[PDB]
Symmetry: none
Subunit: 321 residues, 4 copies
Amino acid sequence: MKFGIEFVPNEPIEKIVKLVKLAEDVGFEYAWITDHYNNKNVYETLALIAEGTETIKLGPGVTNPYVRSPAITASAIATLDELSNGRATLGIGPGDKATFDALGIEWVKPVSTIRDAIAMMRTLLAGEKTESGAQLMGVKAVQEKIPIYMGAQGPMMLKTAGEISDGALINASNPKDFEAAVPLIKEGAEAAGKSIADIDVAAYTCCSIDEDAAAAANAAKIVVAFIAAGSPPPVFERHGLPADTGKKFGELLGKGDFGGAIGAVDDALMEAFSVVGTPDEFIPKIEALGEMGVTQYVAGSPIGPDKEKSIKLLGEVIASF
Amino acid sequence: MKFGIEFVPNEPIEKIVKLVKLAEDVGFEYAWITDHYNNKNVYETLALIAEGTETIKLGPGVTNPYVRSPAITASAIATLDELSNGRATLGIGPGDKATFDALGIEWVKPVSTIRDAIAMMRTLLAGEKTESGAQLMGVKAVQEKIPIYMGAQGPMMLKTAGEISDGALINASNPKDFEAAVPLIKEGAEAAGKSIADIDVAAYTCCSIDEDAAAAANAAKIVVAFIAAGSPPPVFERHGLPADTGKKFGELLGKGDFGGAIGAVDDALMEAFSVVGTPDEFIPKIEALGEMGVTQYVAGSPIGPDKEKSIKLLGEVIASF
Amino acid sequence: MKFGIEFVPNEPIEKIVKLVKLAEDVGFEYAWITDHYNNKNVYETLALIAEGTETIKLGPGVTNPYVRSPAITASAIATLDELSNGRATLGIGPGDKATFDALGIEWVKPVSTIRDAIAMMRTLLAGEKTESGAQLMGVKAVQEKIPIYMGAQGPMMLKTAGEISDGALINASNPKDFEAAVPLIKEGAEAAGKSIADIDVAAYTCCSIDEDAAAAANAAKIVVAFIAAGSPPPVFERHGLPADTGKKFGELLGKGDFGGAIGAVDDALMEAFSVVGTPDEFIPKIEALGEMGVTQYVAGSPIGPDKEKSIKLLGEVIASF
Amino acid sequence: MKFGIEFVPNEPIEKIVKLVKLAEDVGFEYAWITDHYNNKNVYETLALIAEGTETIKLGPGVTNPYVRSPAITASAIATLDELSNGRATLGIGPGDKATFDALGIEWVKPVSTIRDAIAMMRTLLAGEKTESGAQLMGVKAVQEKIPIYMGAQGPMMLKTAGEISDGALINASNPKDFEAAVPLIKEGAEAAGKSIADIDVAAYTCCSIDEDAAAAANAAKIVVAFIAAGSPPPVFERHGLPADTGKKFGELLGKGDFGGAIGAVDDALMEAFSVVGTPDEFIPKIEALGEMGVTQYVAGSPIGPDKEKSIKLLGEVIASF
Ligand SMILES: [Cl-]
Ligand SMILES: [Cl-]
């Protein structure tokens, strides 16, 4: 089991740099920085992180092919690869409708757009020239092949991730989810003459760890609420939950009733959409994920009540693997 | 007269950082970094430059509204403003069809596209929400109003710059060009109820300074050949140069005959398209630019035979103003 | 040689805007819209064209001092200049007795009227106050000097154009016409202390371009028929055509026998009153006009069998200049 | 009771378009744009407004028969009618001596001049040919009969408005004014075999609405000053005001002492020449106007301290009707 950790560039970058270095120091192998126009620039963040670290792999988790030309993305990743001396990773996903409407961007066929974006980035990152004539000149990747992970939350994306990516960042925290997802990724990989062993199945989980299991659960509630809000009914179906649970949280979060949403979050939901608790509790859960194909466990927001402490606690978990 | 300097991110960023720091040490107030998908990401470069400097203003010179959503650009710029404690600048221009063809981007209505991008960025950078509902959350500009400069090489762009920008980055090095351009910026400024005094007129010059005039001239020739090749007929007429000049250089460069191009660059062309020579020779030329309305002298490529050495020589020049 | 294009606002304004946009895209620098009380309002048309274009100059071609107070004309042009960001032009001619009889307007001293009109508009557009006390208040020109072109089809108008205008819109398509007309403009320019080089001599031609020279010629026949019907004796004399040619076509047209008029149009007439043929044929004819002092070639009605196609063909022609 | 709103084209047209769209969204059914040579062209303004709206009726309020030939006005209205798909209206008045003096136009027989102008325009707008031969050809009205409103501030104009118009735009804000005016309109309509029910009696009021009744009153004072300054003796007598009132303000404004004129405006004047206050206060006032025959309430300048806000407030008032 490999470990990754997520950070949202909504706090001072100098602070994020220190936290990533801490994560590196306790054993995390991957650092994933979210990419959203309303937060700090993901590449300016990653660049400063690269300077403050030495071995952890880092990249956007995930960017998308719409807010920036895939060529600009390839260039930003190659630039990061040079700064980090070969530690860049590239996570890319379809993005979200809310964002694109606010940016006046047409959200046309995400799968094929991602497919085309990756094809172009593969070419550019390889130092090659695309049929259209695009080619990197003043920047060059260090790695022979920078890994490209696809954020995949649906069947077509999962199959596609198997076919063209090196990893899948799946927004899920429970074994049952990967029991359903991995097979799709495998089907895609085989179709491409690849093996499921070639794809790093990353569990992009809602993570909250603390000595106080109660405090841990409380810091994750708001995150789990949005997760539920954004999940299709067949997902609540999979976890033995009410098919309309998501809609419920949708309305609360919609109004802006965060307090009510938090209060609506019970144990059945925490169990379905997050990995929360004490260090000891994380172990069997991560093992269960591993048994379902997860090869990378990503500690996602909120990480814990106190990030610095929680990363230290996660270090204990990593030492157990 | 204020001073700016250009750097192309096609060499190690650590080196660029050292060069901007040096430019800062000798009196430059602005650092302009080029932005092209085929070179290193301009924001990763700018972020590091900010970390390695303390008072110099810095920003892309220039980015464009097509390769990245202007909302991403605003975010990149606000992130830089935070990292730099309010020293960011934002230069933006139309871009070039060649690049966009390679990237599969349609180059629609450049003037209105830039005007719309700027309106959106003004709002986002001000911390406000756009009509479309876009708003910066995890990042906030330090400056109340981050300066936006427009690259303007035509009448419509110059008037627009006077109307909606805080400055115009004009690729011209001779007084006669500004004698013709400033009036248009002034028409725009006045149409917007502003004053020509509210616009920083920046001569984005081809600069080549060296103790050895001949060495300086030689280093700039290839740049002058490209400048001439991309110059519209009115520019030549204005300088008393054959109307065909641009097409001649265009063909010479197009067939890879760089020797011919360089050989065709004479005293007349150097005089019209660059500021080259010894420190003592720079003084009068820059004063002449100031008398035609230029408020910021930008030393652009190649800067000189040796950048580090030339930055120090420009330091002498700056001390003379 | 600069290129202009003429459109009659008797078809959807929406279509006209797109065609002007197309013209702008292929290189035309001027758009001229006719102004007749019986067609769509020229300014509503120009205002929408301004919204749908970016760089092409646009203006009425031509209006007159009788159907609207020159002050109203000044305001309409200044309004257009604001909307177009400094791209307005003002073509104004004496008008014609037919129209003014149908409108109950006394065609009093046309030369003095157009002269006094222009003086008033010059003052108003400059934002100054006339002796009579008129002054623009809620509208202001962007350009420091909006160009005023005079429709000049006779000696006194040509001399006056040279004396007080920035250009002359001459309804002629053959070099012999300008051979005779330019000297008159020159006389006026010199009488005013100006030079013929200060006046844009625009050939307001009957243009019809197409791959098929036969089809091109056929589309212009009806237009030529009318031009002939309205041409004075020295014109037919100049082109070695029967002195009664006008009266002839005048009767065929005055009886709705358009089929007859068209059939009565031969090569000698096509040669004397229009520029028709394939793109290859246009080049020499346009250069021939330029040799006679024409500085702006205006492609006038019908433009071609298919306006859209023809504008594209004229684009090829423009690329040759 | 129907609602109209007035805008003066002395601010960017794009802004006016949005304000009219807002007005349309909150229920206004008519938009009136003033027409003076010293402000932006009314038809270019109306054309862009038509583009940015869908149901509100729009037209000049009011134009006159002196600055443009009635035939030009007819085609301008017909053009607007096509652009808005049958939403054009036509307001016409006699104009003012001071304006025509400045334009060197002979202000003769206003009553018959308007009468003749309307007859001509009804013929042209109907697509028919005048006795003089004038006829629209390249433009055609959409509405079977475009409404023509006469600005009527006196007995003859009111009578005439009843006889030949479809509505009267009366510059008055108090019920007492319409008590005196409507009967004159009725007399004129009956004389023409028409019904007072056929004439839209529009109160072209000085309007100022705001949450703060004081702020509202303050924004309207300067407007009221001019109204009083231009009011005939019978009006002052009607509102128990000094016969000197008019000439007293006329003198102050003539001195350029607007601060004084404003300070001279008391509640008595506000009450006689405007509709100011909070939304709740407008309802009874508009009801009172309705009882006197007013069929359209026009919110004229200043509309309120902040137009956008005030339009929203008027939206509430409209909601009550
Ligand atoms: Cl970026
Ligand atoms: Cl008009």
